Amino acid sequence: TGRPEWIWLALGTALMGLGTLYFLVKGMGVSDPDAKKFYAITTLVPAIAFTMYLSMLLGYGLTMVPFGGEQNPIYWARYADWLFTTPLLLLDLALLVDADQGTILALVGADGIMIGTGLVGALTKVYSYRFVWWAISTAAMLYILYVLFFGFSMRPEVASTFKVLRNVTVVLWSAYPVVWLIGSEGAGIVPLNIETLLFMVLDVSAKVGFGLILLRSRAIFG
Amino acid sequence: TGRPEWIWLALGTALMGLGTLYFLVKGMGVSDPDAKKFYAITTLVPAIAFTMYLSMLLGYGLTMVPFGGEQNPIYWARYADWLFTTPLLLLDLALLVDADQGTILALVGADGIMIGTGLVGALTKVYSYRFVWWAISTAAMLYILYVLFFGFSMRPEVASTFKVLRNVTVVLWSAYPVVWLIGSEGAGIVPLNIETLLFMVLDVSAKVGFGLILLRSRAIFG
Amino acid sequence: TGRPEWIWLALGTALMGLGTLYFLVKGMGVSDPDAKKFYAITTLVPAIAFTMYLSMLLGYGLTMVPFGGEQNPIYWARYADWLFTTPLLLLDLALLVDADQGTILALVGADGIMIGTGLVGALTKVYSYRFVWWAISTAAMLYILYVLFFGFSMRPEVASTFKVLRNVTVVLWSAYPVVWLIGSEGAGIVPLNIETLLFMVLDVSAKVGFGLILLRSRAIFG
Ligand SMILES: *C/C=C(C)/C=C/C=C(C)/C=C/C1=C(C)CCCC1(C)C
Ligand SMILES: *C/C=C(C)/C=C/C=C(C)/C=C/C1=C(C)CCCC1(C)C
Ligand SMILES: *C/C=C(C)/C=C/C=C(C)/C=C/C1=C(C)CCCC1(C)C
């Protein structure tokens, strides 16, 4: 299409599709109810991302938002994706370590706040206010990462995989606010095509990279 | 109103309203926590459908979608209905057989995908792409039916009612993609008034017919 | 801004922000998994309300709805707030008394119906029909209050705090339908600025007042 970022939307679509089919095949046969949990969550994440990447690819998950005196192309379908896939990723972490239910509700709710204020900021027409929504969203993000480091001694294989995915999680999640701030939704420093490439690389890593790590671990079996 | 399909929207409204009141009365008194679960789920389904049928009846759950060179009247409120009532129906099935939590998350999530890609397809303005969304949605549907047949030996009364509702479920759910494909959202083979009648007949059967079967079974008591 | 109700939107923003930070601080340290549950739920409620009050303050959570021959300013962000915070409040009540899961699903679902039909009524352009949606929503509300009084003998400290919050809940929740009926969404008897003040006073009391009561009780610890 006439959008230079199309190629990154098509590659992300393909890679999310392929990861989904891989995990679907892989979880074939699994009977341990525990492992079953991790397979369902982990397979669903790139399945949802597949649909939202394809809706961006086809033009559906795109809208124009007037601000700073211009019609800015905003991919809102990323927030419909993240709204469901980021809590699922947190649930994977939470289940690994057998979190208390209050801690899980804390994470899911802070996550909802994170993504929904990101979406409000994305669609806000007063330029300055976009960054107020960014800051609140970033603060929800920092609460989540705090809880992942200070809110949780289980068996050695659980701990190790959990420590690895936790570190993956802090590194990739932390890059999202930066990308948003310098890209088309924020300061407009980086063109939309580079921005879309960056989000594609983070999304595939946090979704398909993260799940490859988890699903190859025996940490997922009781 | 000026919409010939109005009569089917009014009959579905009435029938969903009546089923809701029936199940509400019927569940009056029930103390077995197990039965309580099935009564809550099963009563909520036509209560939600009542509201969405009435919003269609009154004109609120209707929007025009330009495609194939025309303004097509699309009843989007059916997807707001299904988004909540189809997982609830699956939960009824899942609870009957004491499914593992991973299997339940699999079903709910595939269901969300099913309905949300149905909704994207319903609102997509590029005619050809409508059917890509249809196919993905149908594939989520086929995953769900697969899990209902191969993803699950409990007491005889549980098994029997579960096998009956499962068969009801495959027969009616399978008709939805066909109706969509030949009706106003898809190939436009069947007029909207006939389409609305067909969805009304399926909806009442899958919602009020299904629940009459379940709630008369002693399978719902511990 | 040019909206006289701005001051009440700014005060509610501030008060919800402050309550959120207070409860966040207060729950610092808490290790009893039970108390942890109540702290997560109770902190999340004004955190969400903070964001929705601020989105109203900044103009984002406002839309114009044509009806009765005029462009009526409708604050739709209140329904995005309530959609999540009213079930959370009900969960606090439900957990106190160790409700059965079927009773909790009953409450959450009737609540969803309550808020979603409130939102449909808020955005309906046919004046008379606005009040049909009001009545259905009020009936869902009356079901919820019924279940809170007749749908539930635990330890004395649980019962007492539960009876107090239940009474707080019936008194404040019952005022919402009245405000809606006489304010800008309904009969237009009371100007939007007074209406917004009334909702601000109810919201802070039901959210921050209610949680102060709960979180000072030892009822929240196992
Ligand atoms: C499915 C992929 C994942 C793990 C994506 C995560 C996205 C984020 C952590 C988003 C965070 C943002 C903020 C903290 C600030 C404002 C904008 C966001 C939504 C990009
Ligand atoms: C409340 C009534 C029920 C059980 C309705 C079920 C609806 C479906 C199974 C819908 C399925 C569809 C697809 C598989 C393809 C595309 C369009 C849909 C959403 C009609
Ligand atoms: C976060 C604050 C709370 C507890 C707000 C509760 C709101 C209600 C109980 C709303 C009820 C309504 C109806 C019963 C009728 C129609 C309109 C509503 C949504 C205002």
Side-chain angles (χ1 to χ4, degrees):
Chain A
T1 75
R3 296 173 279 136
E5 71 271 19
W6 81 263
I7 175 52
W8 318 119
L9 299 176
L11 221 218
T13 295
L15 297 168
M16 294 294 188
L18 279 52
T20 302
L21 296 171
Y22 179 62
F23 295 148
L24 262 178
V25 190
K26 212 181 169 298
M28 259 192 53
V30 172
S31 88
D32 176 73
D34 287 286
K36 268 174 171 167
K37 312 198 233 168
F38 291 116
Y39 271 96
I41 299 165
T42 307
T43 298
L44 275 163
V45 163
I48 291 159
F50 165 75
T51 65
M52 295 301 98
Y53 265 90
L54 170 78
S55 81
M56 292 187 284
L57 176 63
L58 298 187
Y60 184 83
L62 176 73
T63 196
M64 304 292 273
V65 189
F67 67 83
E70 21 250 69
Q71 283 241 110
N72 311 263
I74 301 294
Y75 284 106
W76 64 260
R78 305 190 201 267
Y79 307 91
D81 177 344
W82 297 341
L83 168 66
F84 300 99
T85 56
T86 56
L88 283 168
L89 287 157
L90 289 173
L91 237 208
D92 265 343
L93 293 178
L95 283 181
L96 237 15
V97 321
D98 182 24
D100 282 332
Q101 279 159 222
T103 302
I104 300 154
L105 184 29
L107 284 164
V108 175
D111 196 295
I113 286 169
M114 184 181 75
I115 302 304
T117 49
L119 175 62
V120 172
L123 302 180
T124 281
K125 284 183 269 225
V126 182
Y127 186 64
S128 292
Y129 294 170
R130 293 181 71 88
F131 304 102
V132 174
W133 295 112
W134 178 88
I136 290 149
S137 180
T138 291
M141 192 192 67
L142 300 173
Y143 178 78
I144 286 161
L145 307 187
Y146 166 79
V147 167
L148 301 173
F149 283 110
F150 301 85
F152 305 142
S153 192
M154 51 277 108
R155 66 244 234 231
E157 38 171 325
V158 173
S160 193
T161 291
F162 167 70
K163 291 189 187 101
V164 170
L165 292 179
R166 177 184 52 210
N167 295 328
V168 168
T169 294
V170 176
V171 181
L172 305 160
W173 289 42
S174 296
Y176 282 81
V178 184
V179 177
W180 194 105
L181 178 59
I182 47 194
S184 51
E185 262 121 83
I189 290 178
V190 175
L192 173 51
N193 95 100
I194 304 199
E195 169 178 12
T196 300
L197 162 71
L198 293 177
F199 275 136
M200 190 255 285
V201 183
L202 300 165
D203 280 343
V204 176
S205 308
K207 307 192 145 67
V208 183
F210 173 107
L212 286 166
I213 294 153
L214 176 64
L215 294 191
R216 311 287 238 108
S217 163
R218 206 75 142 112
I220 70 196
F221 290 94
Chain B
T1 75
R3 296 173 279 136
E5 71 271 19
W6 81 263
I7 175 52
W8 318 119
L9 299 176
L11 221 218
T13 295
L15 297 168
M16 294 294 188
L18 279 52
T20 302
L21 296 171
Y22 179 62
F23 295 148
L24 262 178
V25 190
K26 212 181 169 298
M28 259 192 53
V30 172
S31 88
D32 176 73
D34 287 286
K36 268 174 171 167
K37 312 198 233 168
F38 291 116
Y39 271 96
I41 299 165
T42 307
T43 298
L44 275 163
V45 163
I48 291 159
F50 165 75
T51 65
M52 295 301 98
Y53 265 90
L54 170 78
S55 81
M56 292 187 284
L57 176 63
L58 298 187
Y60 184 83
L62 176 73
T63 196
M64 304 292 273
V65 189
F67 67 83
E70 21 250 69
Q71 283 241 110
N72 311 263
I74 301 294
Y75 284 106
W76 64 260
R78 305 190 201 267
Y79 307 91
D81 177 344
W82 297 341
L83 168 66
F84 300 99
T85 56
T86 56
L88 283 168
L89 287 157
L90 289 173
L91 237 208
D92 265 343
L93 293 178
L95 283 181
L96 237 15
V97 321
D98 182 24
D100 282 332
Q101 279 159 222
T103 302
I104 300 154
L105 184 29
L107 284 164
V108 175
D111 196 295
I113 286 169
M114 184 181 75
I115 302 304
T117 49
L119 175 62
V120 172
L123 302 180
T124 281
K125 284 183 269 225
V126 182
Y127 186 64
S128 292
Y129 294 170
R130 293 181 71 88
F131 304 102
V132 174
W133 295 112
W134 178 88
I136 290 149
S137 180
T138 291
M141 192 192 67
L142 300 173
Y143 178 78
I144 286 161
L145 307 187
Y146 166 79
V147 167
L148 301 173
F149 283 110
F150 301 85
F152 305 142
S153 192
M154 51 277 108
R155 66 244 234 231
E157 38 171 325
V158 173
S160 193
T161 291
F162 167 70
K163 291 189 187 101
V164 170
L165 292 179
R166 177 184 52 210
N167 295 328
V168 168
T169 294
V170 176
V171 181
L172 305 160
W173 289 42
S174 296
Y176 282 81
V178 184
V179 177
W180 194 105
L181 178 59
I182 47 194
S184 51
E185 262 121 83
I189 290 178
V190 175
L192 173 51
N193 95 100
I194 304 199
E195 169 178 12
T196 300
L197 162 71
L198 293 177
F199 275 136
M200 190 255 285
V201 183
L202 300 165
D203 280 343
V204 176
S205 308
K207 307 192 145 67
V208 183
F210 173 107
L212 286 166
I213 294 153
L214 176 64
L215 294 191
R216 311 287 238 108
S217 163
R218 206 75 142 112
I220 70 196
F221 290 94
Chain C
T1 75
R3 296 173 279 136
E5 71 271 19
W6 81 263
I7 175 52
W8 318 119
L9 299 176
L11 221 218
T13 295
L15 297 168
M16 294 294 188
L18 279 52
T20 302
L21 296 171
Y22 179 62
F23 295 148
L24 262 178
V25 190
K26 212 181 169 298
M28 259 192 53
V30 172
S31 88
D32 176 73
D34 287 286
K36 268 174 171 167
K37 312 198 233 168
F38 291 116
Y39 271 96
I41 299 165
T42 307
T43 298
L44 275 163
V45 163
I48 291 159
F50 165 75
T51 65
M52 295 301 98
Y53 265 90
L54 170 78
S55 81
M56 292 187 284
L57 176 63
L58 298 187
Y60 184 83
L62 176 73
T63 196
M64 304 292 273
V65 189
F67 67 83
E70 21 250 69
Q71 283 241 110
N72 311 263
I74 301 294
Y75 284 106
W76 64 260
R78 305 190 201 267
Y79 307 91
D81 177 344
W82 297 341
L83 168 66
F84 300 99
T85 56
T86 56
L88 283 168
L89 287 157
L90 289 173
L91 237 208
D92 265 343
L93 293 178
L95 283 181
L96 237 15
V97 321
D98 182 24
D100 282 332
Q101 279 159 222
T103 302
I104 300 154
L105 184 29
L107 284 164
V108 175
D111 196 295
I113 286 169
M114 184 181 75
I115 302 304
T117 49
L119 175 62
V120 172
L123 302 180
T124 281
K125 284 183 269 225
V126 182
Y127 186 64
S128 292
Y129 294 170
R130 293 181 71 88
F131 304 102
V132 174
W133 295 112
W134 178 88
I136 290 149
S137 180
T138 291
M141 192 192 67
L142 300 173
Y143 178 78
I144 286 161
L145 307 187
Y146 166 79
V147 167
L148 301 173
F149 283 110
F150 301 85
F152 305 142
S153 192
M154 51 277 108
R155 66 244 234 231
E157 38 171 325
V158 173
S160 193
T161 291
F162 167 70
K163 291 189 187 101
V164 170
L165 292 179
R166 177 184 52 210
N167 295 328
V168 168
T169 294
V170 176
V171 181
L172 305 160
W173 289 42
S174 296
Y176 282 81
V178 184
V179 177
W180 194 105
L181 178 59
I182 47 194
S184 51
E185 262 121 83
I189 290 178
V190 175
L192 173 51
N193 95 100
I194 304 199
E195 169 178 12
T196 300
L197 162 71
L198 293 177
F199 275 136
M200 190 255 285
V201 183
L202 300 165
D203 280 343
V204 176
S205 308
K207 307 192 145 67
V208 183
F210 173 107
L212 286 166
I213 294 153
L214 176 64
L215 294 191
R216 311 287 238 108
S217 163
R218 206 75 142 112
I220 70 196
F221 290 94

Short mmCIF file of all heavy atoms in Angstrom, two decimals, chain B residues 45 49 79 81-82 85-86 89 114-115 117-119 133-135 137-139 141 172-174 176-177 180 199 202-203 206-207, ligand 2:
data_model
loop_
_atom_site.label_atom_id
_atom_site.label_comp_id
_atom_site.label_asym_id
_atom_site.label_seq_id
_atom_site.Cartn_x
_atom_site.Cartn_y
_atom_site.Cartn_z
N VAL B 45 -27.19 -14.68 30.45
CA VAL B 45 -27.11 -14.71 28.97
C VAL B 45 -28.31 -14.10 28.30
O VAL B 45 -28.17 -13.17 27.49
CB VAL B 45 -26.85 -16.15 28.48
CG1 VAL B 45 -27.16 -16.35 27.01
CG2 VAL B 45 -25.39 -16.50 28.82
N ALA B 49 -28.75 -10.48 26.16
CA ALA B 49 -29.34 -10.53 24.83
C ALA B 49 -30.61 -9.70 24.72
O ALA B 49 -30.84 -9.05 23.71
CB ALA B 49 -29.58 -12.00 24.44
N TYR B 79 -22.62 -8.09 18.05
CA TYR B 79 -21.29 -8.46 18.56
C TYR B 79 -21.08 -8.05 20.01
O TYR B 79 -20.40 -8.73 20.78
CB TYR B 79 -20.20 -7.83 17.66
CG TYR B 79 -20.51 -8.23 16.23
CD1 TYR B 79 -21.30 -7.47 15.40
CD2 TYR B 79 -19.99 -9.43 15.75
CE1 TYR B 79 -21.60 -7.83 14.11
CE2 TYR B 79 -20.28 -9.79 14.44
CZ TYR B 79 -21.08 -9.01 13.64
OH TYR B 79 -21.34 -9.44 12.36
N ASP B 81 -23.39 -8.23 22.20
CA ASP B 81 -24.10 -9.33 22.83
C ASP B 81 -23.19 -10.55 22.93
O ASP B 81 -22.89 -11.06 23.99
CB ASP B 81 -25.38 -9.60 22.03
CG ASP B 81 -26.23 -10.76 22.48
OD1 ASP B 81 -25.74 -11.60 23.24
OD2 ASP B 81 -27.40 -10.86 22.03
N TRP B 82 -22.80 -11.04 21.74
CA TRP B 82 -22.06 -12.29 21.64
C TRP B 82 -20.74 -12.27 22.40
O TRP B 82 -20.23 -13.26 22.94
CB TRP B 82 -21.83 -12.60 20.15
CG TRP B 82 -23.07 -12.82 19.32
CD1 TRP B 82 -24.32 -13.13 19.81
CD2 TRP B 82 -23.22 -12.76 17.90
NE1 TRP B 82 -25.21 -13.25 18.77
CE2 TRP B 82 -24.57 -13.04 17.58
CE3 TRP B 82 -22.36 -12.50 16.83
CZ2 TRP B 82 -25.04 -13.05 16.27
CZ3 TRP B 82 -22.82 -12.51 15.53
CH2 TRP B 82 -24.18 -12.79 15.24
N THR B 85 -22.00 -13.13 25.76
CA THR B 85 -22.83 -14.31 26.02
C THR B 85 -22.18 -15.59 25.50
O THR B 85 -22.36 -16.64 26.10
CB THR B 85 -24.21 -14.15 25.37
OG1 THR B 85 -24.11 -13.90 23.98
CG2 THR B 85 -24.92 -12.93 25.96
N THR B 86 -21.41 -15.51 24.40
CA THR B 86 -20.80 -16.79 23.98
C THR B 86 -19.80 -17.31 24.98
O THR B 86 -19.72 -18.51 25.29
CB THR B 86 -20.19 -16.71 22.57
OG1 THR B 86 -19.24 -15.65 22.46
CG2 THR B 86 -21.30 -16.44 21.55
N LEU B 89 -21.72 -19.07 27.71
CA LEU B 89 -22.27 -20.39 27.33
C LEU B 89 -21.16 -21.42 27.45
O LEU B 89 -21.31 -22.53 27.95
CB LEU B 89 -22.91 -20.28 25.95
CG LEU B 89 -24.25 -19.52 25.90
CD1 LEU B 89 -24.57 -18.96 24.54
CD2 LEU B 89 -25.38 -20.45 26.38
N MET B 114 -12.91 -14.95 18.08
CA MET B 114 -14.01 -15.25 17.17
C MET B 114 -14.93 -14.06 17.00
O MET B 114 -15.28 -13.57 15.93
CB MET B 114 -14.81 -16.47 17.66
CG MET B 114 -15.92 -16.89 16.69
SD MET B 114 -16.81 -18.33 17.39
CE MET B 114 -17.80 -17.48 18.66
N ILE B 115 -15.40 -13.52 18.14
CA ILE B 115 -16.35 -12.42 18.04
C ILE B 115 -15.73 -11.12 17.59
O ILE B 115 -16.21 -10.33 16.80
CB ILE B 115 -17.04 -12.22 19.42
CG1 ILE B 115 -17.76 -13.47 19.93
CG2 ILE B 115 -17.98 -11.04 19.34
CD1 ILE B 115 -18.78 -13.91 18.88
N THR B 117 -13.01 -10.64 15.70
CA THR B 117 -12.73 -10.60 14.27
C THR B 117 -14.03 -10.62 13.46
O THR B 117 -14.10 -10.02 12.40
CB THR B 117 -11.85 -11.77 13.80
OG1 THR B 117 -12.33 -13.02 14.27
CG2 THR B 117 -10.44 -11.64 14.41
N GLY B 118 -15.08 -11.26 13.98
CA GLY B 118 -16.40 -11.07 13.36
C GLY B 118 -16.84 -9.63 13.29
O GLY B 118 -17.38 -9.09 12.34
N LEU B 119 -16.57 -8.87 14.37
CA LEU B 119 -16.94 -7.47 14.39
C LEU B 119 -16.10 -6.60 13.47
O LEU B 119 -16.55 -5.74 12.74
CB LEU B 119 -16.78 -6.95 15.85
CG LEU B 119 -17.02 -5.44 15.96
CD1 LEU B 119 -18.44 -5.09 15.55
CD2 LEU B 119 -16.72 -4.98 17.38
N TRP B 133 -11.61 -11.69 7.41
CA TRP B 133 -12.00 -11.66 8.82
C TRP B 133 -12.99 -12.77 9.12
O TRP B 133 -12.91 -13.38 10.16
CB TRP B 133 -12.57 -10.28 9.23
CG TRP B 133 -11.49 -9.23 9.10
CD1 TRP B 133 -11.38 -8.20 8.23
CD2 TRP B 133 -10.33 -9.17 9.96
NE1 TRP B 133 -10.23 -7.49 8.47
CE2 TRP B 133 -9.58 -8.07 9.52
CE3 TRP B 133 -9.91 -9.96 11.03
CZ2 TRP B 133 -8.37 -7.72 10.15
CZ3 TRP B 133 -8.71 -9.62 11.66
CH2 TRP B 133 -7.99 -8.51 11.19
N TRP B 134 -13.90 -13.03 8.17
CA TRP B 134 -14.80 -14.18 8.35
C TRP B 134 -14.06 -15.49 8.53
O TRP B 134 -14.34 -16.39 9.32
CB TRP B 134 -15.78 -14.20 7.14
CG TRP B 134 -16.71 -15.38 7.21
CD1 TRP B 134 -17.92 -15.43 7.85
CD2 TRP B 134 -16.50 -16.67 6.63
NE1 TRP B 134 -18.49 -16.68 7.70
CE2 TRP B 134 -17.63 -17.46 6.95
CE3 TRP B 134 -15.48 -17.25 5.86
CZ2 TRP B 134 -17.77 -18.80 6.53
CZ3 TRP B 134 -15.62 -18.57 5.45
CH2 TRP B 134 -16.75 -19.33 5.79
N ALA B 135 -13.00 -15.72 7.74
CA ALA B 135 -12.30 -16.99 7.77
C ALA B 135 -11.51 -17.20 9.04
O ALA B 135 -11.35 -18.21 9.67
CB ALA B 135 -11.32 -17.03 6.58
N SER B 137 -12.28 -15.77 11.84
CA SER B 137 -13.27 -15.98 12.90
C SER B 137 -13.80 -17.42 12.88
O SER B 137 -14.01 -18.08 13.89
CB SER B 137 -14.43 -14.98 12.72
OG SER B 137 -15.40 -15.20 13.76
N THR B 138 -14.02 -17.93 11.68
CA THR B 138 -14.52 -19.31 11.54
C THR B 138 -13.45 -20.24 12.07
O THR B 138 -13.66 -21.23 12.76
CB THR B 138 -14.90 -19.57 10.08
OG1 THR B 138 -16.08 -18.80 9.76
CG2 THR B 138 -15.25 -21.03 9.81
N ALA B 139 -12.17 -19.94 11.79
CA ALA B 139 -11.16 -20.84 12.33
C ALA B 139 -11.11 -20.85 13.85
O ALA B 139 -10.85 -21.87 14.47
CB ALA B 139 -9.79 -20.48 11.75
N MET B 141 -13.71 -20.52 15.77
CA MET B 141 -14.91 -21.30 16.01
C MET B 141 -14.61 -22.79 15.92
O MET B 141 -14.97 -23.57 16.78
CB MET B 141 -16.04 -20.98 15.01
CG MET B 141 -17.34 -21.64 15.56
SD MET B 141 -18.67 -21.66 14.36
CE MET B 141 -17.93 -22.82 13.18
N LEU B 172 -25.92 -25.31 16.54
CA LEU B 172 -26.33 -23.92 16.34
C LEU B 172 -25.16 -22.97 16.03
O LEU B 172 -25.30 -22.11 15.18
CB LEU B 172 -27.06 -23.41 17.58
CG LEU B 172 -28.25 -24.23 18.06
CD1 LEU B 172 -28.55 -23.91 19.51
CD2 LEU B 172 -29.46 -23.97 17.17
N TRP B 173 -24.07 -23.11 16.77
CA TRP B 173 -22.93 -22.21 16.52
C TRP B 173 -22.48 -22.33 15.08
O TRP B 173 -22.17 -21.33 14.45
CB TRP B 173 -21.78 -22.52 17.48
CG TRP B 173 -22.08 -22.13 18.90
CD1 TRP B 173 -23.25 -22.30 19.58
CD2 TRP B 173 -21.16 -21.50 19.81
NE1 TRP B 173 -23.12 -21.81 20.87
CE2 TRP B 173 -21.85 -21.32 21.02
CE3 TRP B 173 -19.83 -21.08 19.69
CZ2 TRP B 173 -21.24 -20.72 22.12
CZ3 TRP B 173 -19.22 -20.48 20.78
CH2 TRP B 173 -19.94 -20.32 21.97
N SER B 174 -22.46 -23.57 14.54
CA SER B 174 -22.01 -23.71 13.15
C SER B 174 -22.86 -22.97 12.14
O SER B 174 -22.48 -22.60 11.03
CB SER B 174 -21.98 -25.20 12.75
OG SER B 174 -21.04 -25.88 13.55
N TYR B 176 -24.08 -19.96 12.49
CA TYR B 176 -23.83 -18.51 12.45
C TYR B 176 -22.93 -18.06 11.33
O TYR B 176 -23.25 -17.13 10.62
CB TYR B 176 -23.26 -18.05 13.82
CG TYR B 176 -24.33 -17.92 14.89
CD1 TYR B 176 -24.78 -19.03 15.58
CD2 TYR B 176 -24.91 -16.69 15.20
CE1 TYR B 176 -25.76 -18.94 16.56
CE2 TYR B 176 -25.89 -16.60 16.18
CZ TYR B 176 -26.32 -17.71 16.86
OH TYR B 176 -27.28 -17.65 17.84
N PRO B 177 -21.76 -18.68 11.12
CA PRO B 177 -20.91 -18.25 10.01
C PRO B 177 -21.60 -18.35 8.67
O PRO B 177 -21.39 -17.56 7.76
CB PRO B 177 -19.73 -19.21 10.07
CG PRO B 177 -20.06 -20.28 11.05
CD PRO B 177 -21.16 -19.74 11.93
N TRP B 180 -24.02 -15.35 8.29
CA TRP B 180 -23.23 -14.14 8.04
C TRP B 180 -22.72 -14.09 6.61
O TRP B 180 -22.77 -13.09 5.90
CB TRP B 180 -22.11 -14.14 9.08
CG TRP B 180 -21.34 -12.88 9.27
CD1 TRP B 180 -21.46 -12.00 10.32
CD2 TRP B 180 -20.33 -12.34 8.41
NE1 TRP B 180 -20.58 -10.96 10.15
CE2 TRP B 180 -19.88 -11.13 8.99
CE3 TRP B 180 -19.76 -12.75 7.20
CZ2 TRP B 180 -18.89 -10.36 8.40
CZ3 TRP B 180 -18.78 -11.98 6.61
CH2 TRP B 180 -18.35 -10.79 7.22
N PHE B 199 -31.06 -15.08 12.62
CA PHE B 199 -30.27 -14.87 13.83
C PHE B 199 -31.14 -14.89 15.08
O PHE B 199 -30.71 -15.32 16.14
CB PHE B 199 -29.52 -13.53 13.77
CG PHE B 199 -28.18 -13.61 13.04
CD1 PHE B 199 -27.83 -12.63 12.14
CD2 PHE B 199 -27.33 -14.68 13.31
CE1 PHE B 199 -26.62 -12.65 11.46
CE2 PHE B 199 -26.12 -14.71 12.63
CZ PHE B 199 -25.78 -13.72 11.74
N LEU B 202 -31.74 -18.57 15.78
CA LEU B 202 -30.59 -19.18 16.44
C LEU B 202 -30.33 -18.67 17.85
O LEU B 202 -30.06 -19.44 18.77
CB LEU B 202 -29.31 -18.95 15.58
CG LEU B 202 -29.42 -19.54 14.17
CD1 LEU B 202 -28.33 -18.99 13.26
CD2 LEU B 202 -29.35 -21.06 14.26
N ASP B 203 -30.40 -17.35 18.03
CA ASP B 203 -30.12 -16.73 19.33
C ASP B 203 -31.05 -17.25 20.42
O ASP B 203 -30.68 -17.61 21.53
CB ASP B 203 -30.29 -15.22 19.20
CG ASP B 203 -29.12 -14.50 18.57
OD1 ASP B 203 -28.05 -15.15 18.56
OD2 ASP B 203 -29.26 -13.36 18.10
N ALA B 206 -30.12 -20.95 21.20
CA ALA B 206 -28.83 -21.18 21.85
C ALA B 206 -28.77 -20.59 23.25
O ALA B 206 -27.98 -20.93 24.14
CB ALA B 206 -27.73 -20.56 20.98
N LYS B 207 -29.69 -19.64 23.45
CA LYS B 207 -29.71 -18.93 24.72
C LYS B 207 -30.84 -19.47 25.59
O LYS B 207 -30.55 -20.09 26.62
CB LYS B 207 -29.83 -17.43 24.48
CG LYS B 207 -28.77 -16.86 23.53
CD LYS B 207 -28.79 -15.32 23.58
CE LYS B 207 -27.35 -14.82 23.42
NZ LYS B 207 -26.83 -15.12 22.06
C1 LIG D 2 -25.69 -15.77 21.95
C2 LIG D 2 -25.65 -16.66 20.79
C3 LIG D 2 -24.63 -17.40 20.34
C4 LIG D 2 -24.35 -18.81 20.81
C5 LIG D 2 -24.02 -16.90 19.10
C6 LIG D 2 -22.90 -17.45 18.52
C7 LIG D 2 -22.27 -16.75 17.40
C8 LIG D 2 -21.28 -17.32 16.66
C9 LIG D 2 -20.82 -18.71 16.91
C10 LIG D 2 -20.62 -16.48 15.66
C11 LIG D 2 -19.71 -16.89 14.73
C12 LIG D 2 -19.18 -16.16 13.59
C13 LIG D 2 -18.17 -16.73 12.91
C14 LIG D 2 -17.53 -18.07 13.19
C15 LIG D 2 -17.74 -16.22 11.56
C16 LIG D 2 -17.94 -14.77 11.32
C17 LIG D 2 -19.08 -14.15 11.97
C18 LIG D 2 -19.66 -14.76 13.23
C19 LIG D 2 -19.26 -13.76 14.36
C20 LIG D 2 -21.21 -14.67 12.99
#
